[PDB]
Design a protein around this nucleic acid. Structure first.
Lengths: 172, 106, 137, 197, 99, 51
RNA sequence: CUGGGCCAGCAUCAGUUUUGGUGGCAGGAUAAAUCCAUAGGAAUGUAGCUUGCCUCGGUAAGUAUUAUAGCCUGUG
RNA sequence: AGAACUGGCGAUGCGGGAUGAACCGAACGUAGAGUUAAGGUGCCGGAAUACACGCUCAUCAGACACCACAAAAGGUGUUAG
RNA sequence: UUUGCUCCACACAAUAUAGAUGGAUACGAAUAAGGCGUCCUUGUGGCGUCGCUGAACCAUAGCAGGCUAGCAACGGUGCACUUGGCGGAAAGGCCUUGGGUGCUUGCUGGCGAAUUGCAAUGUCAUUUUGCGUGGGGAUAAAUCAUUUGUAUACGACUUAGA
């Protein structure tokens, strides 16, 4: 829950003489360190298969780096979450350079707008959106128009000293 | 030779303290021109003087001096911590203080 | 008058090809180009020539300059270089007061104590010849 | 780093100005604030007037003369914001304060003395555009301050004087930058440029 | 005895050959050649306290100085530089300045 | 009478444990690993980069 | 005038500790990128070409996938 | 008002919660140097008017556990779904 | 009441000081806009330029800044005078004209500095207040007591008395 890395977690039920070689399951988990990621792996597995980590084991844990960490992409994000009064699915879009960058703004946004802390959200799917205008959401489409430019009116420069011998301007 | 100063000016702000308990044993100084603990690292170990007037002459002078030295930086804005042979009087919170350029390990 | 007059604020635009001066960080001091807009607050930049690594940056740690050159959006580092060079961006920058003052201020800061002394003596010379002028017309 | 600092109150946000000006006193620096009447408070005028009335209701019940004092002048409304930010009842407090003066308009010596702004307390830098605010002068007047027009009259009279003054200045600074021109490109000038001067 | 033997030169700024302590000094980057300067005889016991001013002292000053001044002169404004006292001006920041 | 810390103070470092002498002399607190080329198999990358 | 006595500065150390500069290694998709090669694509379609608009400079739609810009994806 | 287990107060200062028997932190010979806890860092006051993404304008905004209260029900305010 | 009283000079003893140590360096106004320069129809005008901080500008070299000789300017700066003016928000300060005088690091010479011994006490600021000299100056009242009653518990108030 912080500056996110994304991990492959791969685990399985412990072998039995009856079933050596039990099936392997993978999740992609966003977390900040690997102790959290494996926690998170088990949290989800327990809600999906009978297994507690006391009957299972983690076979591999590997960080998945962004393939094109400077191509700008538009991501579709699918999320399940709890409100003070129920639980909701929700599709949002995020424009960024990496999943890991996108996911982190997802979490800030769920916090800002819906007052959802991390314990309350599940990431359902995160996906680069291939064709522009499969993009559904205005506040990301806006950036997709041709020869896009804008000013940044009213610039405030931070001052290094407490007094200034001239009245400042906001001119950019 | 209008100017003769070989010290940097500083101000004596406070003793070290928590909200309701102070420690006269350490003094907090704000050195002119120093804005970051990085900058203030230059001044650590340098000598300071608080310089005052009195009525009784001593070595035929009415000027007196309390010496001390900068010991570490303080917080994020260049404030520095200082110990003095004595302990700055406290009426002097706000008074000017002088921070020398020796011991120089330029 | 008799034309409609409307002076319009001539803002530096965030746009592909806009060249920016990096305020903070490790690439502090260097020029990079906006390659692609990310949102109202972030952009992809790239400063191959100054050796600032193509990266997503927050506009608040950058300052827009008046210079801009032709660059297709999304352009990878290689073609950013080709284009930046074709455009003679550093040439233009160097020629500005803005870049000149930075240089001036940099040079002052490197002055030796002996050097500071010479500047004094030279100043006093210039002063002298100036005050007699400023006294004749 | 100045014996006395003189601040133009104009376009400054009370509480943030008050905050910086108070730390200045507690660190030994003399301050005079002028033009207190063109100080701002954030949020529209009805709310601020309302606030001042809530403050007006407080008085010692048995003797309103010993209960809180309600100062209506802009300078003094500011002084209140400041005073609350200084341990004004201790010796050191009174000393900090004595280093500070506040004025409506800018009365003489200060009128020929430079003024500075405080960026971190400057409204236009600080308030987000669109957000409503209040002129301290207008607020005072509405709760009984008598000298808005007098200070207004005096300011225009001053401003005429200051213009003439600034115009001579500029004209002089023309002659200098002119008559300089010859020396401006001279061997000594090229030398100075080599060392950044 | 850990100290620095210092000159001036005397004729330049009135400072005689002398002991100075290294922690009370800033080293500028400006430097005169000291090749043709004797200096072998000078040591701790030279300064040893045994009012007046010894004739040797006065003659060594002239021996050492003449050569130093001869070097100092090859560089314009060096003499003047050394005659002039150092001080901090409003604005100076020791932790920033080059020297 | 005074605990000296072998982690500063090479003298007592050498007092407890020699070897240190050779440890340092031979470097080996650095020391290059060998070099192999072994590649991961298809399937490992297929699933790393899966979905 | 020495000596004690005490106090201080610097130096070389010891104990504790705080704040910098720098060297060599290890791992991972033996980082991911960039860069290079190659295959294949598309559009917020670059050059051409088509047809009305022109002030004939340029221009708007349409064709057109590298050309008189470039980008994306795979593999190496 | 009355029981269960444990931990406290009572018998106990200290740091935080402005204040406060019982909460949080932490228990106490005389001191020096360092580091932290809980809690804080606009100014009162030691400590970034720090950095980052949003959201909010209240003619009765809001602002931090114990804690110094607020509900049913409504809004073509604005946000995201 | 005998000493007295007052303003200006510079002279000794006490005394205090929230804290000098190169300079508090003056348009106004806007900020989704401005400053400056230049032109003019003097404007919601035209052209040029600047910002991205005062990291400026000004000042700054000499025994804490000595003694001496010149060149070139005819400037700079201090001082005490002087011709005009302007400033009432708390003006108590500002601009100006004319000489005189010291200094001038714009530039070129001749001397000096030590032993205060390797840092420590080493530049003097401005307030009061008592006295000391020489000049200019000025030459009262209030209170108690007595009295009025427009006043009054007592003080207080208000009247009158050479």
């Amino acid at each position: 829950m912080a500056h996110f890395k994304e991990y492959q977690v791969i685990g399985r039920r412990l072998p039995t003489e009856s079933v050596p070689e039990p099936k392997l399951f993978r999740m992609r988990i966003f977390a900040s360190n690997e102790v959290i990621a494996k926690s998170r792996y088990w949290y989800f597995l327990q809600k999906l298969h009978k297994v507690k980590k006391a009957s299972g084991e983690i076979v591999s844990i590997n960080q998945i780096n962004e393939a094109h960490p400077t191509k700008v992409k538009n991501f579709g994000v699918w999320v399940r979450y709890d409100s003070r009064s129920g639980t909701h699915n929700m599709y949002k879009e995020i424009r960024d350079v990496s999943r890991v960058a996108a996911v982190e703004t997802l979490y800030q946004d769920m916090a800002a707008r819906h007052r959802a802390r991390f314990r309350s959200i599940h990431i359902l799917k995160v996906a680069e959106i291939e064709k522009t205008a499969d993009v559904k959401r205005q506040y990301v489409k806006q950036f997709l128009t041709k020869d896009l430019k804008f000013p940044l009116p009213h610039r405030v420069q931070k001052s290094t000293k407490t007094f200034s011998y001239k009245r400042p301007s906001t001119f950019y | 030779a209008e100017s003769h100063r070989l010290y940097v000016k500083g101000k004596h702000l406070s003793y070290q303290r928590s909200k309701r308990v102070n420690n006269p044993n350490v003094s907090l100084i704000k050195i002119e021109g120093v804005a970051t603990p990085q900058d203030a690292q230059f001044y650590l170990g340098k000598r300071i003087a608080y310089v005052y007037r009195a009525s009784k002459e001593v070595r035929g002078s009415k000027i007196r001096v309390m010496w001390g030295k900068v010991t570490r930086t303080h917080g994020n804005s260049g404030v520095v911590r200082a110990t003095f042979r004595n302990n700055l009087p406290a009426k002097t919170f706000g008074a000017s203080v002088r921070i020398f350029l020796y011991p120089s390990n330029i | 008058s008799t034309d409609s007059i409307v002076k319009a604020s001539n803002w530096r635009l965030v746009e592909v090809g806009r060249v920016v001066l990096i305020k903070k960080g490790q690439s502090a001091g260097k020029l990079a180009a906006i390659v692609e807009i990310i949102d109202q607050k972030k952009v992809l930049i790239d400063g191959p020539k100054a050796g600032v690594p193509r990266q997503a940056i927050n506009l608040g740690q950058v300052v827009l300059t008046p210079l801009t050159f032709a660059l297709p959006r999304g352009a990878r580092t290689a073609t950013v270089s080709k284009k930046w060079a074709a455009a003679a961006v550093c040439e233009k920058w160097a020629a500005s007061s803005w870049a000149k003052k930075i240089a001036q201020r940099e040079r002052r800061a490197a002055l030796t104590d002996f050097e500071r002394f010479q500047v004094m003596v030279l100043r006093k010379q210039k002063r002298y010849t100036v005050k007699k002028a400023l006294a004749k017309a | 780093v100045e014996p006395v600092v003189v601040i133009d109150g104009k376009g400054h946000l009370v509480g943030r100005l008050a905050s910086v000006v108070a730390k200045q006193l507690l660190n030994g620096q003399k301050i005079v604030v002028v033009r207190a009447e063109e100080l701002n408070i954030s949020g529209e005028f009805f709310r601020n007037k309302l606030k001042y009335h809530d403050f007006l209701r407080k008085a010692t019940a048995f003797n309103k003369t010993r209960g809180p004092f309600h100062f209506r002048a802009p300078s003094r409304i500011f002084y209140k914001a400041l005073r609350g930010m200084v341990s004004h009842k201790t010796a050191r407090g009174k000393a900090a304060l004595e280093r500070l003066k506040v004025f409506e308009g800018i009365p003489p010596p200060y009128d020929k003395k430079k003024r500075v702004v405080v960026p971190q307390a400057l409204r236009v830098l600080r308030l987000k555009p669109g957000r409503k605010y209040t002129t301290l002068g207008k607020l005072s007047t509405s709760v009984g301050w008598k000298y808005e027009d007098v200070v207004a009259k005096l300011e225009a009279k001053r401003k005429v004087s200051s213009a003439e003054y600034y115009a001579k200045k500029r004209a002089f600074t023309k002659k200098v930058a002119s008559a300089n021109a010859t020396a401006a490109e001279s061997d000594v000038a090229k030398q100075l440029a080599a060392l950044g001067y | 005895d850990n100290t620095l033997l210092i000159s001036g030169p005397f004729k330049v700024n009135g400072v005689p050959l002398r002991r100075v302590n290294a922690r009370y000094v800033i080293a500028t980057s400006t430097k005169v050649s000291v090749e043709g300067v004797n200096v072998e005889k000078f040591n701790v016991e030279y300064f040893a306290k045994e009012k007046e001013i010894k004739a040797e002292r006065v003659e060594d000053q002239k021996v050492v100085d003449k050569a130093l001044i001869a070097e100092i002169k090859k560089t314009p404004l060096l003499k003047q530089y050394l005659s002039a006292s150092f001080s901090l001006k409003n604005g100076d920041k020791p932790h920033m300045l080059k020297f | 009478v005074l605990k000296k810390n072998p982690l500063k103070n090479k003298q007592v470092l050498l007092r407890l444990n020699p070897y240190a002498k050779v440890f340092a002399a031979e470097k080996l607190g650095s020391k290059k690993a060998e070099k192999t080329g072994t590649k991961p198999a298809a399937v490992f990358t297929e699933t790393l980069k899966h979905d």
